[PDB]
Design a protein around this ligand. Structure first.
Ligand SMILES: O=P(O)(O)O[C@H]1[C@@H](OP(=O)(O)O)[C@H](OP(=O)(O)O)[C@@H](OP(=O)(O)OP(=O)(O)O)[C@H](OP(=O)(O)O)[C@H]1OP(=O)(O)O
Ligand SMILES: Nc1ncnc2c1ncn2[C@@H]1O[C@H](COP(=O)(O)OP(=O)(O)O)[C@@H](O)[C@H]1O
Ligand SMILES: [Mg+2]
Ligand SMILES: [Mg+2]
Ligand SMILES: [Mg+2]
Ligand SMILES: [Mg+2]
Ligand SMILES: [Mg+2]
Length: 325
């Protein structure tokens, strides 16, 4: 019989153009059949009624019942491409940063301010005009303030008096905008946050997309905080610039992929002061315009499936060479 690769995610993702481009290529593997789990099934059917698969590609996004996916994987014991239990931790910036540190991955110097919403003034924060002290640790402006929820994209940057003060408020893109300037100079009064050193880049973010630990595609885009105007192309896509990862960065990608156990894993690098710092690890993420990425990604995923499952299915398999980017 065919090796079944099941795809289990919210329809917003499963039916996205990048996903459909990748799945059509995976389907070209002679011995692989792709089955995309319907959103109505994921949300409303007990996991005992979900389709069978031999290999499961499943990932959390807003509204996804991760508990069910974990229960399904437990029930059916498929080969799992992106580890499901780690996807709970990926939702928490504190957990993400803890893992990066444990792996010796460079990241911004940071401190966690946990607030008890019941008693919010009891927290370990002292604020001055050009700095904060979080658990006694001093962050001079510019510094960055991130909601502990990785799914909350309201990231604020605070400017020093020397640069005019105020703050830049970043958010999930709305049309042509990715951030706005605010005259507000004081930090947020409610919520729990990570405070971190601002890393000066050349005005671009590097977005990295792994497919297993030995492949990573990178591309750059204008830092959302710079002025907040999104650079769009004639097709309405964000303008993305060429990047080739150096040896250090290729190692970072290998570590991130393995440490988070996410074969397909997006993360962000800040190229600053002659090094590269990880500031965000997103897990399963979508490259949006590269035909070669779709080719490479589908081929690597198919080969991973074949290498793991062909012997069990009595299918001959010789593992081929794969590009590193
Ligand atoms: O990780 P993914 O593939 O799930 O996508 C993430 C995010 O990627 P990230 O994880 O690296 O931060 C995307 O940002 P980018 O890297 O393309 O700039 C964003 O696209 P966007 O803002 O629409 O950007 P445009 O298409 O307008 O240029 C998308 O937002 P939505 O589709 O509106 O929900 C997000 O989904 P979710 O987190 O569920 O809101
Ligand atoms: N420590 C930092 N120094 C400089 N810029 C940062 C820093 N942390 C985040 N940024 C900027 O803010 C953007 C959003 O932060 P990020 O941690 O990636 O949040 P998100 O999970 O919402 O994508 C980054 O892409 C980068 O441009
Ligand atoms: Mg096929
Ligand atoms: Mg996500
Ligand atoms: Mg959007
Ligand atoms: Mg990010
Ligand atoms: Mg993120």
């Amino acid at each position: 019989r065919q090796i079944v690769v099941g795809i289990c995610s919210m329809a917003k993702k499963s039916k996205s153009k990048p996903m459909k481009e990748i799945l059509e290529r995976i389907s070209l593997f002679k011995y692989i059949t792709v089955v995309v789990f319907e959103e109505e099934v994921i949300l409303n059917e007990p996991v005992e009624n979900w389709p069978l698969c031999d290999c499961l590609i499943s990932f959390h996004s807003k509204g996804f019942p991760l508990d069910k996916a974990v229960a399904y994987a437990k029930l059916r014991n498929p080969f799992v491409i992106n580890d499901l239990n780690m996807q709970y931790l990926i939702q928490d910036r504190r957990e993400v940063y803890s893992i990066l540190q444990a792996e010796g991955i460079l990241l911004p110097r940071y401190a966690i301010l946990n607030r008890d919403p019941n008693n919010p003034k009891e927290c370990n924060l002292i604020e001055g005009e050009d700095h904060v002290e979080v658990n006694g640790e001093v962050f001079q402006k510019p510094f960055v303030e991130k909601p502990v929820s990785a799914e909350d994209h309201n990231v604020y940057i605070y400017y020093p008096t020397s640069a005019g003060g105020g703050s830049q408020r970043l958010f999930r893109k709305i049309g042509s905008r990715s951030s706005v300037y605010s005259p507000e100079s004081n930090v947020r009064k409610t919520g729990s946050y990570i405070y971190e050193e601002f890393m000066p880049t050349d005005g671009t973010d590097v977005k990295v997309y792994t497919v297993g630990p030995d492949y990573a595609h990178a591309e750059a885009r204008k830092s959302p905080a710079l002025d907040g105007k999104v650079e769009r192309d004639s097709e309405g896509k964000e303008v993305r610039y060429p990047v080739i990862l150096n040896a250090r960065e290729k190692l970072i990608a290998w570590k991130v992929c393995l440490a988070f156990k996410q074969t397909v894993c997006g993360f962000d690098l800040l190229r600053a002061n002659g090094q590269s710092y990880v500031c965000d690890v997103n897990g399963f993420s979508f490259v949006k315009n590269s035909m070669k990425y779709y080719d490479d990604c589908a081929k690597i995923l198919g080969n991973i499936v074949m290498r793991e499952l062909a012997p069990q299915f009595h299918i001959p398999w010789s593992i081929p060479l794969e590009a590193e980017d």
